[PDB]
RNA sequence: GUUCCCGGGCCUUGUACACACCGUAACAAGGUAACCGUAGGGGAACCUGCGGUUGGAUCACCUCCU
RNA sequence: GCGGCCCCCUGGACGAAGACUGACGCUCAGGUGCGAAAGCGUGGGGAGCAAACAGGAUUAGAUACCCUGGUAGUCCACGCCGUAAACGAUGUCGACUUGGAGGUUGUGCCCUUGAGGCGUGGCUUCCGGAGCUAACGCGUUAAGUCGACCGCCUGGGGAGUA
């Protein structure tokens, strides 16, 4: 879900605007930070056969998101991972 | 369910028992569950009830007798 | 047709239960969609309220126990 | 004259509540020899009564189809419920290399230099009405000249 | 208050309940002649006995 | 003017406008207006009705359903035309050759009821010549004796008799038909859109049609 | 997803005819507009417009005749999967000439005989009949 | 008077039938609806339980409210 | 596949009005995950029903219809088998194509004054047009018109088995 007062913080940092959450350097961050807020879900209970697809969805959209950023500008790519830390 | 009608009656009149359920709860708890079966006869029934509505729509245009 | 879901816009409450009594009977049964012309929105809202009131003994479940 | 021709002939039945009785069918096509042909499906309890019934419908469905003296105009198929008869105009193709339940129609229409083969279905009723469908599906160079170009040596030259 | 004799109660109406729309002009109820016309013309309907 | 001030006026929700194209249509919750091609295409009717009258043409006024069933008897018997206000027989252009089996029968029945044994027999058989005669006169007595085939096939609606339209396209002759925003204009050569069949409309419509046929016969 | 514009364009013309329409509209590629101009000289399509800033709304006024389609047997030839290339002499004329093949040549878009006229060969996009 | 009964006829419904009605398992509602999957058993077809589907039949009468 | 209520964690779908990177999109053999019911190993368990089995009969016979009992099982948790009519038998993403009755969930605009009217999306049902087909019929959720990707068939039985 990603709570709103974590989200607005992240968007205003990476982006120039507060509505600039459509730029790849921000799209990937809110996706990663969404999973970082979802860790509390897959850490406990374990059997979420429905939320399983949700994970595969947002993370796959991130694997290809990082795919084009990789092919277009390796400077902001290595900068995305250097400002948040979503490489490893 | 509970009918009284004071004392001038000389009749039962369990007409509210039928307006309640009567055979309602029975239809499901008299013979085994079968789970999916009733669903099947629900589709057939609707097909013939909605066709009754199509019937009411077919008679309005002519029926010249 | 009814004037409770016309002059009664936005979620029908259940503190005072007299209005749900228009939509249930004196037996403890819940009135069906086809009688009072009331689109499901209003209908299922009443549904939530009712289940809650019966847990708290405001509304009864069956007739007698 | 108009040249009558028998294509299809069979042995079907009715069967009553007594024993078994047979009906007989025929499908004929007539053609003056210019492209004006007409198909007719006749059926009766006997063949001759059916072919004359096939004559009633034949001289009734006379369709006008222009041609290029013996040879056709352009290559076109013939869809009719599974039937896909393809026909090649072939200028100076030397004769008509068509086939059974398909040749005798293009002959009575005055189209003697063509090639053809019935694909898809196999019933004479269908393959024949596929070649008939191939006649109506044709566009005359003059017709296409009327549809576009507005000059024959414009759409072709 | 007959429909065959008189008729239209609603604007261009077949009283039997077959022709309602105001598209209907003159067409009767073949069973009991209701010429779909003006209920205003029903202030001009004279009969006999 | 404005053709009774309602030639396009009002049309049944169940008009279901596949028909929509050529009528334009201003809608009044069930619709109402078949507007356009309705209006100017009445003059094109005057056009062909004059030409096929120069080639000496007969009209077969087919107006059924009691909403034209007497103006048809009028607009047909006011000039020369033959008509069908009564039950339109499915086969009056295709089976027409075999309908004339019966027309040649009526051609002799009429003769024998006027010069034959109309009353030179048992009064029961004489009555049989009476009853039979009038049954052939109200349903087939409209076209009665056609002889030369009808050149213009008039239809009251594509809504109701598209088969009369179907059979018309077996000859490819001019099909003249007044229709409604619930029809299937598939084969008619000179369509005349407009409201439904309506004795008010049909009196203006039909009357003006037979009269314009009278132009070409001169 | 809407992979080949030219292809979905031919589809709007096929059903355009099977809809009794007189003018279709579409986001524009100048190849599409070029073909319209070529089919204008031929008499298939008539009067094309390019009105539209960032949304080029190409308008094309189709054509009937007797109440019959002028474009009735049309289809994309060079498909993204198998793009067929032709020379100058192997080049097939649609219906032996009663139809034209609109080819992408070394001089933009023209017909099959206009390419023979050009003296070069190329990509046969779609047959028009 | 047609509900009882014997025969005839019209309409409709159903059939893997038309060669045309050791145990009946399917096809009429086969008088216990059919079929697939899972486990076990029985001389043998298949049976029992569970989930699903329509490649299924009639929705005809007897009693109560305007 | 799943119907009482609620608490904790949380997923998918959708809509009004704007801001953006600027095709970051789709499918895909080997692979992985979910995978009704059932069987088995293990710890709890048993009201109702019910394989094997005993008994009384319809019967020429009953290990079958029915009934009185009754074990595995039915239930909860951890794994294996990884199977199906897992079938509106309709693979998945995108684009295109006259309407009515509904059902169901939101919003915008107007006197929501009142049980409404005119649009915009998702899912689904019936009647139909363009179209396809052997027919039945599906029909904006298509069996219609295309692009893309994978799998499958070449008569059945043998056998979806060793």
Curated annotation (Swiss-Prot), chain A:
Keyword Cytoplasm: no
One record GO biological process: translation
Keyword Glycosyltransferase appears in the UniProt entry: no
Keywords from the named record: Ribonucleoprotein, Ribosomal protein, RNA-binding, rRNA-binding
HAMAP family to which the protein is assigned, alphabetical: Ribosomal_uS15_B (MF_01343_B)
Entry-linked NCBIfam families: S15_bact
Name of the protein this chain belongs to: Small ribosomal subunit protein uS15
Organism: Escherichia coli O45:K1 (strain S88 / ExPEC)
Gene it is expressed from: rpsO
Curated annotation (Swiss-Prot), chain B:
Composition-biased stretches (Basic residues): 43-56
Basic and acidic residues: compositionally biased ranges: 57-65
Disulfide pattern: none
Pfam entry (one): Ribosomal_S21
Ribonucleoprotein listed as a keyword: yes
UniProtKB keywords: Ribonucleoprotein, Ribosomal protein
Molecular functions (GO terms): structural constituent of ribosome
GO CC annotations, alphabetized: ribonucleoprotein complex; ribosome
Region (Disordered): 40-65
Family: Belongs to the bacterial ribosomal protein bS21 family.
UniProt-recorded name of the protein: Small ribosomal subunit protein bS21
Native species: Escherichia coli O9:H4 (strain HS)
Gene assigned in the entry: rpsU
Swiss-Prot record, chain D:
SUPFAM superfamilies: dsRNA-binding domain-like (SSF54768), Ribosomal protein S5 domain 2-like (SSF54211)
Gene3D superfamilies to which the protein is assigned, alphabetical: 3.30.160.20, 3.30.230.10
Presence of keyword Repeat: no
Transmembrane segments: none
Entry GO CC: small ribosomal subunit
Single GO MF descriptor: structural constituent of ribosome
GO biological process: translation
Source organism superkingdom: Bacteria
Keyword Cell division: no
Stored InterPro entries: Ribosomal_Su5_D2-typ_SF, Ribosomal_uS5, Ribosomal_uS5_bac-type, Ribosomal_uS5_C, Ribosomal_uS5_N, Ribosomal_uS5_N_CS, Ribsml_uS5_D2-typ_fold_subgr
Alphabetized UniProt keyword annotations: Acetylation, Ribonucleoprotein, Ribosomal protein, RNA-binding, rRNA-binding
UniProt xrefs under Pfam families: Ribosomal_S5, Ribosomal_S5_C
Sequence ranges assigned to domain S5 DRBM in this UniProt record: 2-65
Comment on protein domains: The N-terminal domain interacts with the head of the 30S subunit; the C-terminal domain interacts with the body and contacts protein S4. The interaction surface between S4 and S5 is involved in control of translational fidelity.
Record NCBIfam families: rpsE_bact
Assembly and interaction partners: Part of the 30S ribosomal subunit. Contacts proteins S4 and S8.
Family: Belongs to the universal ribosomal protein uS5 family.
HAMAP family (alphabetical): Ribosomal_uS5_B
Protein's job: With S4 and S12 plays an important role in translational accuracy.
Protein name (record): Small ribosomal subunit protein uS5
Organism: Escherichia coli O157:H7
Gene: rpsE
Swiss-Prot record, chain E:
Binding site residues for Zn(2+) 1: 14, 16, 29, 32
Function text: DNA-dependent RNA polymerase catalyzes the transcription of DNA into RNA using the four ribonucleoside triphosphates as substrates.
Oligomeric form and interacting partners: The RNAP catalytic core consists of 2 alpha, 1 beta, 1 beta' and 1 omega subunit. When a sigma factor is associated with the core the holoenzyme is formed, which can initiate transcription.
Family: Belongs to the RNA polymerase beta' chain family.
Protein's recorded name: DNA-directed RNA polymerase subunit beta'
Organism: Escherichia coli O157:H7
Included stretch of the parent chain: 57 to 105 of 1407
């Amino acid at each position: 879900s990603l709570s709103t007062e974590a989200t607005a913080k992240i968007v205003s940092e990476f982006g120039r605007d507060a509505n600039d959450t459509g730029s790849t350097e921000v799209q990937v961050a809110l996706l990663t930070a969404q999973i970082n807020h979802l860790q509390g879900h897959f850490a406990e209970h374990k059997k979420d056969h429905h939320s399983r697809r949700g994970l595969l969805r947002m993370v796959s959209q991130r694997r290809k998101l990082l795919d084009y950023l990789k092919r277009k500008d390796v400077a902001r790519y290595t900068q995305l991972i250097e400002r948040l830390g979503l490489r490893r | 369910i509970k009918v009284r009608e004071n004392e001038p009656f000389d009749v039962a009149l369990r007409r509210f028992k039928r307006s309640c359920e009567k055979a309602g709860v029975l239809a499901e708890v008299r013979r085994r569950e079968f789970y999916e079966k009733p669903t099947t006869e629900r589709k057939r029934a609707k097909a013939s009830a909605v066709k009754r509505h199509a019937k009411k729509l077919a008679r309005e245009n002519a029926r010249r007798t | 047709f009814c004037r409770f879901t016309a002059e009664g816009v936005q979620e029908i409450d259940y503190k005072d239960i007299a209005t749900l009594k228009n939509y249930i009977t004196e037996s403890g049964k819940i009135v069906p969609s086809r009688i009072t012309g009331t689109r499901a929105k209003y209908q299922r809202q009443l549904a939530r309220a009712i289940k809650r009131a019966r847990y708290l003994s405001l509304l009864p479940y069956t007739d007698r126990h | 004259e108009l040249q009558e021709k028998l294509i299809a002939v069979n042995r079907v039945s009715k069967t009553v509540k007594g024993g078994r009785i047979f009906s007989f069918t025929a499908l004929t096509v007539v053609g003056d020899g210019n492209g004006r042909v007409g198909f007719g499906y006749g059926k009766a309890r006997e063949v001759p009564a059916a072919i004359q019934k096939a004559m009633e419908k034949a001289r009734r469905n006379m369709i006008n189809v222009a041609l290029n003296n013996g040879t056709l105009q352009h290559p076109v198929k013939g869809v009719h419920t599974g039937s896909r008869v393809f026909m090649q105009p072939a200028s100076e193709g030397t004769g008509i290399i068509a086939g059974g339940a398909m040749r005798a129609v293009l002959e009575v229409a005055g189209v003697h230099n063509v090639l053809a083969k019935a694909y898809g279905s196999t019933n004479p009723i269908n393959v024949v009405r596929a070649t008939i469908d191939g006649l109506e599906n044709m566009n005359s160079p003059e017709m296409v000249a009327a549809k576009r170009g507005k000059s024959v040596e414009e759409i072709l030259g | 208050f007959c429909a065959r004799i008189f008729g239209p109660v609603k604007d261009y109406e077949c009283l039997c309940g077959k022709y309602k729309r105001l598209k209907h002009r003159g067409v009767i109820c073949e069973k009991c002649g209701v010429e779909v016309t003006q209920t205003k013309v029903r202030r001009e309907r004279m009969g006999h006995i | 003017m404005l053709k009774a001030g309602v030639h396009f006026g009002h049309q049944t929700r169940y008009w279901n406008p596949k028909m929509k194209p050529f009528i334009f249509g201003a809608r009044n919750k069930v619709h109402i207006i078949n507007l356009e091609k309705t209006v100017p295409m009445f003059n094109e009717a005057l056009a062909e009705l004059n030409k096929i009258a120069s080639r000496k043409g007969k009209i077969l006024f087919v107006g059924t359903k009691r909403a034209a069933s007497e103006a048809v008897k009028d607009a047909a018997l006011s000039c020369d035309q033959f008509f069908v206000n009564h039950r339109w027989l499915g086969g009056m252009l295709t089976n027409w050759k075999t309908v004339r089996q019966s027309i040649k029968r009526l051609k002799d029945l009429e003769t024998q009821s006027q010069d034959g044994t109309f009353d030179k027999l048992t009064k029961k058989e004489a009555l049989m010549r009476t009853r039979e005669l009038e049954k052939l006169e109200n349903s087939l007595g409209g076209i009665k004796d056609m002889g030369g085939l009808p050149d213009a096939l008039f239809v009251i609606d594509a809504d109701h008799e598209h088969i009369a339209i179907k059979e018309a396209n077996n000859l490819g002759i001019p099909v003249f038909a007044i229709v409604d925003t619930n029809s299937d204009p598939d084969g008619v050569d000179f369509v005349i859109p407009g409201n439904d069949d309506a004795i008010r409309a049909v009196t203006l419509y039909l009357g003006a049609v037979a009269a314009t046929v009278r132009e070409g016969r001169s | 997803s809407m992979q080949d514009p030219i292809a979905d364009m031919l589809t709007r013309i096929r059903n355009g005819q099977a809809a009794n329409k007189a003018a279709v509209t579409m986001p524009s590629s100048k190849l599409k507009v070029a073909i319209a101009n070529v089919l204008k000289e031929e008499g298939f399509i008539e009067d094309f417009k390019v009105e539209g800033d960032t949304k080029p709304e190409l308008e094309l006024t189709l054509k009937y005749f007797q109440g019959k389609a002028v474009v009735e047997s049309i289809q994309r030839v060079s498909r993204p999967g198998l793009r067929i290339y032709k020379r100058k002499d192997e080049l097939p004329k649609v219906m032996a000439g009663l139809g034209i093949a609109v080819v992408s040549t070394s001089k933009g878009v023209m017909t099959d005989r206009a390419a023979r006229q050009a003296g070069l060969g190329g990509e046969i996009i779609c047959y028009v009949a």
